[PDB]
C-alpha cells in the first residue's frame, strides 16, 4: 500500500516533469506569420429544411454527397447535398440521442444517447429499406459518442468514466476502458482506426488503444464540462470544446494543451469543433448564436457565419472539402461554400 | 434540362419531406413533464399514484393528452449536463415529504428539499417554465407533531401548535423562494393519498401554461 503510493507519487512527478520539459515554444510563436485566410464571405447555397426540433449531430459520408443529421425529435436523415434531396429517413427508438455515425464502406450507420445503448443500422439491403442490425448494451451511464472502426467493430463512450470497443458481429465487448473520474462525453476516431481520444467532464482527456484496453495519456487544463471533441485528420492532434467559453487544441503526443481560443467579449459555451479538409479552418460553434470560423493556426480572428438565431450544436466538413454544414437549435441546417 | 432519374429523385425527396413534416407536426401535441425530488423523499408513492438504466419513460394518457413523465432518478451525474434537453417541457413536478419535519438525516430533510426547490426555481433554462409542488406524508405529520415542538427546524416561529398552523408555515416557506413571480409561478399542494387531486392539480397547471403560450403567441 505505502510502496504503491510512493511509486504512484514518483510516476506523477515524472509525468509532471515530462509535461514541463515540452513547453518552450508554441503554435503562435511559430505559425503566427502564416498568411491569414482573410474574410470568408461565405454564403448560404442551400437551406436543408425539415427539422422540427433542435439538431444535435450530423456526419458527412465518404462520397461527399450523402449526409446524415439527427435531431432531438427522433429523426436521422440521409440526404443529398448536390440537389437538396432526401434519400432516407430513419426513425429512432429514444429521442434523447446525442451522437451519430456513418460507416466508411458506405453500408451502415449508428446512433446513441442517454438510454445507454449504441444501435447499428444497415443500408444496402436487397429488400428495400434500412433496418437495425445491432443493439449494444453494457454501459451504465448515458452514451455520448460513437465511431465505426470497420464494418464489424464499433467504439462507444458514456457518462461513467467508461469507454468500450465492441465486436459488432457477436455483441460482446472485446475490451473496455476505465480510469476517468467524471462523465465522458465524446471521442474522435483516428484516421488509422486504431486509437481514440475521449473528453470527460473533469477537464480531462484520455487516449486509448482499441486492441488492448489500456490508456496511455491524460491531458488537463480546463475549468468546466468539456462538451464536444474532434480529431485532426492526420492523427497527431485533436481539439475539444469547453463550457467555460474557450476552445482548445491538444496534441496526442505533447502531453499538454497546445492552444486556447477565447476573447474577452465571449462568455458562452462551445458546443462543437470541427476542422476543414486542409486544416486551415477550425469551425467552432457557440451559444452566442454564431458559428465562427477560426484561422486554426493563429487563433487570431473570426470569420463569421452569422446565419442562425439560436444556439449552435454541430458542424462538419466533407472529405473533398467541397462544403460545410452547420446545424443549430433553430431547426435548420445550412450548406455553405 | 433533367433526365428521368433526376425527376424520380426529386419525387422521392418531396415525398420524404411530406411524411417528415406530418410526423413532426403530430409530435408537437404532446405534454412533457420532468420529475424531481430528493433522495428517500417518498416520491415513489407520488410517482405510482400520480400518473401525470438511462431514463424511465413513464408514459400516460390522460384527458386525451399524452403525458411523458421522465423519471431520471437512475442517473448519477450532475444535472448541468443533461437537464437542458427538456427545455421545452411544460412542467417540473416536485416531490417533498412533510414527515421529516425534524428528523435529522445527518442535518434534516426539509432544509435540503428547500435547497432543491430554490435551485430548480432560479435555473436559467426554467425562466418561463412552471414548477408544480407536492408536499406529502401529512397524516403521519398530524400524528407526529403531537410530541415534537415544531421549533427544532424553524427556531423563529412561535405559532399555535395545531396541524393547520404548522402546515401553513410549511407551505408558505416552500412557496417563498420565487425570485421571478413576473414570468413563472410556483403552485403548492399537499399529497391527498385518498384523493385523485394529485392528478387534477397537475393537469390544471399544464393547461394554464398552455393558455399562456397560445396567448403570448399573438404578441401580447
Amino acid at each position, epitope marked *: 500500500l505505502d510502496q504503491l503510493r510512493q511509486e504512484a507519487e514518483q510516476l506523477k512527478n515524472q509525468i509532471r516533469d515530462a509535461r514541463k520539459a515540452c513547453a518552450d515554444a508554441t503554435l503562435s510563436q511559430i505559425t503566427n506569420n502564416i498568411d491569414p485566410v482573410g474574410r470568408i464571405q461565405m454564403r448560404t447555397r442551400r437551406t436543408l429544411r425539415g427539422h422540427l426540433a433542435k439538431i444535435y449531430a450530423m456526419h458527412w459520408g465518404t462520397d461527399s454527397r450523402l449526409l446524415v443529421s439527427a435531431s432531438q425529435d427522433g429523426k436521422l436523415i440521409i440526404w443529398d447535398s448536390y440537389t437538396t434531396n432526401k434519400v432516407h429517413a430513419i426513425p429512432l427508438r429514444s429521442s434523447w440521442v446525442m451522437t451519430c455515425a456513418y460507416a466508411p464502406s458506405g453500408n451502415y450507420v449508428a446512433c446513441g444517447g442517454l438510454d445507454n445503448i449504441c444501435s447499428i443500422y444497415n443500408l444496402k439491403t436487397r429488400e428495400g429499406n434500412v433496418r437495425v442490425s445491432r443493439e449494444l448494451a453494457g454501459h451504465t451511464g448515458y452514451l455520448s459518442c460513437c465511431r465505426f472502426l470497420d464494418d464489424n467493430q464499433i467504439v462507444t463512450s458514456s457518462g461513467d468514466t467508461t469507454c468500450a470497443l465492441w465486436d459488432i458481429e457477436t455483441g460482446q465487448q472485446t475490451t473496455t476502458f476505465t480510469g476517468h473520474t467524471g462523465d465522458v462525453m465524446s471521442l474522435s476516431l483516428a484516421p488509422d482506426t486504431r486509437l481514440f481520444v475521449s473528453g470527460a467532464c473533469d477537464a480531462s482527456a484520455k487516449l486509448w488503444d482499441v486492441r488492448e484496453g489500456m490508456c496511455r495519456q491524460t491531458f488537463t487544463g480546463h475549468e468546466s464540462d468539456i462538451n464536444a471533441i474532434c480529431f485532426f485528420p492526420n492523427g497527431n492532434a485533436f481539439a475539444t470544446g469547453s463550457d467555460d467559453a474557450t476552445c482548445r487544441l491538444f496534441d496526442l503526443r505533447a502531453d499538454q494543451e497546445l492552444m486556447t481560443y477565447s476573447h474577452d467579449n465571449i462568455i458562452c459555451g462551445i458546443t462543437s469543433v470541427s476542422f476543414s479538409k486542409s486544416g486551415r479552418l477550425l469551425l467552432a460553434g457557440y451559444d452566442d448564436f454564431n458559428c465562427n470560423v477560426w484561422d486554426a493556426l493563429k487563433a487570431d480572428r473570426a470569420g463569421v457565419l452569422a446565419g442562425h438565431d439560436n444556439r449552435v450544436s454541430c458542424l462538419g466538413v466533407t472529405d473533398d472539402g467541397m462544403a460545410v454544414a452547420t446545424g443549430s437549435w433553430d431547426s435548420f441546417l445550412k450548406i455553405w461554400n | 434540362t433533367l*433526365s428521368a432519374e433526376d425527376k424520380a429523385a426529386v419525387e422521392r425527396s418531396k415525398m420524404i419531406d411530406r411524411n417528415l413534416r406530418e410526423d413532426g407536426e403530430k409530435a408537437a401535441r404532446e405534454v412533457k413533464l420532468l420529475l424531481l425530488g430528493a433522495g428517500e423523499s417518498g416520491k415513489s408513492t407520488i410517482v405510482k399514484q400520480m400518473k401525470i438504466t438511462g431514463i424511465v419513460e413513464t408514459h400516460f394518457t390522460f384527458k386525451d393528452l399524452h403525458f411523458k413523465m421522465f423519471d431520471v432518478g437512475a442517473q448519477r451525474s450532475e444535472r448541468k449536463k443533461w437537464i437542458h434537453c427538456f427545455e421545452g417541457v411544460t412542467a417540473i413536478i416536485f416531490c417533498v415529504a412533510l414527515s421529516d419535519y425534524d428528523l435529522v438525516l445527518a442535518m434534516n430533510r426539509m432544509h435540503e428539499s428547500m435547497k432543491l426547490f430554490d435551485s430548480i426555481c432560479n435555473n436559467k433554462w426554467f425562466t418561463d417554465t412552471s414548477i408544480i409542488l407536492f408536499l406529502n406524508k401529512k397524516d403521519l405529520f398530524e400524528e407526529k407533531i403531537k410530541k415534537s415542538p415544531l421549533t427544532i427546524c424553524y427556531p423563529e416561529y412561535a405559532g399555535s401548535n395545531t396541524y393547520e398552523e404548522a402546515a401553513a408555515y410549511i407551505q408558505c416557506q416552500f412557496e417563498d423562494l420565487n425570485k421571478r413571480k413576473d414570468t413563472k409561478e410556483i403552485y403548492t399542494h399537499f399529497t391527498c393519498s385518498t384523493d385523485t387531486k394529485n392528478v387534477q392539480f397537475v393537469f390544471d397547471a399544464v393547461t394554464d401554461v398552455i393558455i399562456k403560450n397560445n396567448l403570448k403567441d399573438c404578441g401580447l
Partner: single-chain antibody
Amino acid sequence: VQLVESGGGLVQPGGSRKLSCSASGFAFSSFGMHWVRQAPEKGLEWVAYISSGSGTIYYADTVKGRFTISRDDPKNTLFLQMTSLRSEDTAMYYCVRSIYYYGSSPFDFWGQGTTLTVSDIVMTQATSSVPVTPGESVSISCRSSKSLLHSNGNTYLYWFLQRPGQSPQLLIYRMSNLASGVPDRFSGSGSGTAFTLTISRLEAEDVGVYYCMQHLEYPLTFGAGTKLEL
C-alpha cells in the same frame, strides 16, 4: 427477392388483356416499375413506366392510348391493361424493378415473364453471331442513332444476358457498373454511341443472347440481338 408475372395466354385481336405482377420478399411501395416485352423470335421492346407516388407515367409510341399502367402498394401488386390487340403485340412480357436515388442500380431484378399469343432514338447491333469455344474471350457491340450521354454526367446504356428458357439478368446497369449476383469476369462499357460488352475466360452457361438498351428519353427502344454459339 421474388417477382412473379401472371395473366398471360392466347387472345384474338381486339378485346382487352390485363397482366398482373405479384411481388414478395422486399419493400414493394418504395420502388418504381417498368413493363418490357420481347418478340417471339427477336429483340426486346419497352412498353411502360410507372413511378413512386403514382404521379409519373410514360408509354410507348406504338401503343399509347391502348395501354394503362397502375400499381397497388398495400397488396404489393402491379398491373398493365391493354386494349385493341394486334399481331405486332405477340410477345413475352416482364416486370422490372428500379429505384432512383443517388447511387442506386436500376433494372436490378427481372421477373420470369408471361407469354401473350396474339394471332425515337434508333439502336442496332453491329454483328449477328460469333462462334465461341470455352477458354476464349468474347466481345459484343451495339450502335445508336443519337447520344445517350445526358447533361448530369451519366450514360444510359443497359446490358442484359438471356439463356434458353431463362429470363434476362442485369449484366450492366448504366453501361459501366456491375450488378450483384453476377461473376466478376463480365464487363461492359461504351463510347460516343458505340457500345460494347466483354466476357473473359468463357465458361458454360455464358453462351446465350446479349441485349442493349437506352434510357435517355421516353420512349425506350431496343436492338434486335447478338448471340454466341458453342
